[PDB]
Amino acid sequence: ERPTFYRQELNKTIWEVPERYQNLSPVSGAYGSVCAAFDTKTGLRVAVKKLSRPFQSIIHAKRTYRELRLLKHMKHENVIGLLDVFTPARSLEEFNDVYLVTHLMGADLNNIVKCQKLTDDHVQFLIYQILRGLKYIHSADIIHRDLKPSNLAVNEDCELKILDFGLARHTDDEMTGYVATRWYRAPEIMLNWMHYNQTVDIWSVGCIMAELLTGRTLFPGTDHIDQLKLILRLVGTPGAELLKKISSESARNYIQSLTQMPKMNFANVFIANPLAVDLLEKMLVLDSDKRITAAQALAHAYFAQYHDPDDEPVADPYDQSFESRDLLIDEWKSLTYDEVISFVPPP
């Protein structure tokens, strides 16, 4: 059970990992840093993410606990699976750092697009797999909140996984608010502060598909204002009845202060498979109540070559009852420790 650890330091921070993992090569962040390594047990190359002081604040501890419990609950073909989770600490009193180990496929779409020319046949399969994973994710009342090309890994056979559930969580009615990445963030995140829902992921998938089809970012906003401007330059300025639904009065006033430019023609900007254009238009919509769902997306004609209702699974519901409480730091840490100890490696 208990393995032997060796202490390696990189970028002036210690990495205490089992001998099982060798050849640590870094790949850095606010909440966690990642190293690539070879697993002598499985013979596969793996990615090892060390959470940076996961229990320094309620925010960090809550993120650590929820990501760990999500990955342990996620069991789907197009979702990254947790191979190992360990800690050098031999007791709860010593527990501080948390390490996550997961499969390491070829490269992510970010690097891939910059050196490979993609076919429409590739985009079909890729976005089909993305939506296939999203159906599973959303069915568990989970929301990813950070779908971007760098959080999607793929191999030469075009089989992909959804990565990085660090911002994901169980969907509630009021949430963190400032989430996702600027160039893939849905409008309802910037307006209607803290009262978005699962529909945000579909906007990210639409941006992903547009970028894969064209080869360049769809909304390369310099800042938040530039993001809103680039979005409305395509999807068109909203309507009065939609404006009343915006919770922020400042947001309504700013939107009204803008020079009204309508929805440009969907077949004029992606001059491209018409079916993909139709689907994009179903996805890139302002009103979340009228945006296409992942379940509805899979049934789209664009995925006829891969759609299979019998093989599109659905997840069991996720139990956030432990999180629904306002716990202290030590209680979050104890829950995370119990979750680490209770891990059983997958076949």
From Swiss-Prot:
Residue numbers covered by motif TXY: 176-178
Co-factor(s): Mg(2+)
Catalytic reaction equation(s): L-seryl-[protein] + ATP = O-phospho-L-seryl-[protein] + ADP + H(+); L-threonyl-[protein] + ATP = O-phospho-L-threonyl-[protein] + ADP + H(+)
Effect annotated for changing residue 172 to A: Emulation of the active state. Increase in activity
Major site of localization recorded for this protein: cytoplasm
GO MF entries: ATP binding; enzyme binding; MAP kinase activity; MAP kinase kinase activity; mitogen-activated protein kinase p38 binding; NFAT protein binding; protein phosphatase binding; protein serine kinase activity
Signal peptide bounds: none
Effect on the protein of changing residue 30 to V: Lowered kinase activity
InterPro entries per the UniProt record, alphabetical: Kinase-like_dom_sf, MAP_kinase, MAP_kinase_CS, MAPK14, MAPK_p38-like, Prot_kinase_dom, Protein_kinase_ATP_BS
Modified positions (Phosphothreonine) in chain numbering: 13, 176, 259
Stored Pfam families: Pkinase (PF00069)
Documented EC number(s): 2.7.11.24
Positions where Phosphotyrosine occurs in the chain: 178, 318
Effect the entry attributes to changing residue 49 to R: Loss of kinase activity
Top-level taxon in the UniProt lineage: Eukaryota
UniProt cross-references to CDD domains, sorted A to Z: STKc_p38alpha (cd07877)
Residues binding ATP: 27-34, 49
GO annotation terms (biological process): 3'-UTR-mediated mRNA stabilization; angiogenesis; apoptotic process; bone development; cartilage condensation; cell morphogenesis; cell surface receptor protein serine/threonine kinase signaling pathway; cell surface receptor signaling pathway
Active site annotation, chain numbering: 164
Effect of residue 317 to R: In a lung adenocarcinoma sample; somatic mutation
Protein name in UniProt: Mitogen-activated protein kinase 14
Organism of derivation: Homo sapiens
